[PDB]
């Protein structure tokens, strides 16, 4: 009882910055890229790893050499061959400073030889420690043991690009008219702020197992709008936010359609550490003391989000030694008194309060959390803090964070791979992902001496120390560990509710009748 049509409409939640995987860093972007392109390895509905462009792979016993065997007859959507040269080209372009990739640092996380030096402009991109041993053998050379390397390769930043096309056309290769990819789908249409339309890529190596023939991604920013369209039956899966007010109702009324995936994600307010006055540790500490997490998780959202005071989710692999900081165990009244003293010491008063804006991406749930935070900060400090809200469109919000044009910004980080360092690495001084501009050489040293570590206990202790240092510096304001609530029509199959990264590959779905 497979449906005859096999069409699906999904809310992607925003207009993506770009379809170039080297120019982007967000979930709307990766969701698109993952339909059009495929890296060495990919995943099933529960996030378990399965062959992608590589049909086979192995590692040396020291976990430093990774050899990928590519498919000898695999073709790009235009019929050009997919070779290890495309991977060499793409990974070089990622770390090349002229690309200005937001995820430039990702191959540094993988410990690829010379990756950090290329990022720092000290070596040329061609000096990166990856190679096409022949057209269908791609080898990756790491300077330290990286036993979790395969899982890293599934990330959008490590997707290959069609070298011959990109070289001919430059950055104009991403135009719908020119876009060539090696994933299960290709672009049929793109209307800015409205819809992206996908069609089968018939040259996909695994096209014979693809079931969905076509799909539409919408760009609905507000969960209530999302939910109304679902109810009208004009889309089949919502994005991963739902209205907290409607939620208990939706669960019972639309029983079996409400999915809630426990995800490897942390929601935070990021403090601009190099802008006055958030360069003052004392002020960063005040904000942390005075913000009640349980108010947001329990009363503003109440969907299963759990309160947290560290960046790494402690339930991630090798995260188990990370401790919640001591102040989180103190009464709020004790916390609030400390915050007021600190703010008074920094020269704030009811007459002259600490004034700043929360920047967030347009989204009613974010607005709700911002209003609560603003509200808690004023009341909890008896008028020493006065907060405004600045909402921006997704692309504009990303540009602002990246450019440092913010005081405090809503921030979500979802694991790029199921191991602690996907969070740990974010806060390195030199990480291209560090929009906080947090910099502590003791943090960097804690993480650096972890890559050397040979067993999981040793790595786990270093990550606990890194967290303790970020904690004492009050680098950001962690709030909660994510849950991913979505509505999914009963006739949509292949969505598990068990993928810790909550990826959606069209090629994993099918419609039943």
């Amino acid at each position: 009882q497979l449906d005859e049509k096999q069409h699906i409409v999904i809310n992607n939640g925003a207009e993506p910055q770009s379809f170039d995987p080297h120019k982007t860093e967000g979930v709307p972007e990766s969701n698109v890229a993952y339909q059009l392109l495929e890296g060495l390895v990919t995943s099933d509905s529960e996030g378990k790893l399965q062959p992608g462009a590589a049909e086979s792979w192995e590692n040396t016993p020291d976990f430093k050499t990774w050899t990928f065997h590519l498919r000898k007859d695999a073709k790009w959507s235009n019929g050009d061959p997919v070779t290890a040269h495309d991977f060499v080209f793409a990974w070089r372009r990622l770390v090349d400073p002229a690309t200005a990739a937001p995820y430039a640092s990702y191959l540094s996380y993988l410990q690829v030889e010379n990756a950090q030096d290329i990022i720092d402009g000290k070596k040329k991109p061609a000096e990166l420690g990856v190679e096409a041993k022949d057209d269908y053998t791609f080898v990756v050379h790491a300077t330290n043991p990286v036993p979790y390397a395969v899982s890293l390769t599934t990330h959008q930043s490590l997707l290959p690009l069609p070298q011959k096309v990109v070289e001919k056309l430059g950055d104009a290769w991403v135009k719908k008219e020119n876009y060539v990819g090696n994933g299960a789908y290709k672009l049929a249409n793109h209307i800015i702020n409205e819809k992206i339309e996908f069609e089968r890529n018939p040259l996909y190596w695994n096209d014979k197992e693809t079931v969905i023939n076509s799909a539409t991604f919408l760009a609905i920013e507000n969960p209530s709008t999302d939910v109304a369209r679902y109810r009208a039956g004009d889309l089949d899966m919502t994005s991963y936010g739902l209205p907290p007010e409607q939620f208990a109702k939706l669960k019972k009324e639309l029983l079996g359609e409400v999915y809630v995936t426990r995800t490897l994600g942390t929601y935070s307010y990021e403090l601009n550490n190099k802008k006055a006055p958030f360069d003052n540790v004392n002020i960063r500490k005040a904000l942390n003391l005075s913000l009640d997490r349980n108010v947001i998780t329990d009363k503003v959202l109440g969907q299963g989000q759990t309160p947290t005071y560290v960046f790494t989710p402690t339930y991630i692999e090798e995260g188990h030694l990370i401790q919640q900081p001591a102040y989180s165990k103190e009464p709020m009244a004790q916390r609030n008194e400390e915050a007021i003293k600190l703010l008074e010491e920094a020269g704030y008063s009811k007459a002259n309060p600490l004034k700043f804006s929360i920047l967030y991406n347009t989204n009613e749930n974010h607005k709700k959390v911002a209003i609560a935070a603003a509200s808690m900060w004023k009341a909890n400090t008896k008028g020493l803090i006065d907060v405004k809200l600045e909402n921006q469109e997704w692309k504009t919000y990303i540009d602002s964070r990246r450019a440092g044009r913010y005081d405090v910004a809503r921030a979500g980080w979802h694991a790029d791979y199921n191991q602690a360092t996907t969070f740990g690495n974010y806060f390195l001084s030199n990480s291209s992902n560090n929009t906080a501009k947090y910099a502590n050489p003791e943090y960097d040293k804690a993480m650096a001496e972890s890559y050397a570590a040979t067993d999981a206990e040793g790595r786990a202790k270093a990550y606990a120390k890194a967290e303790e240092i970020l904690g004492k510096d009050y680098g950001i304001v962690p709030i909660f560990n994510y849950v991913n609530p979505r509505l999914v029509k009963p006739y949509v199959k292949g969505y598990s509710g068990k993928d810790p990264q909550d990826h959606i590959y069209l090629r994993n779905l099918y419609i039943i009748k």
């Binding site: 939640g13 860093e25 967000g26 991406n361 749930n365 979500g412 980080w413 991913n484």
Partner: peptide
């Protein structure tokens, strides 16, 4: 990756 949510 930075989430939309």
């Amino acid at each position: 990756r930075p989430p939309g949510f």
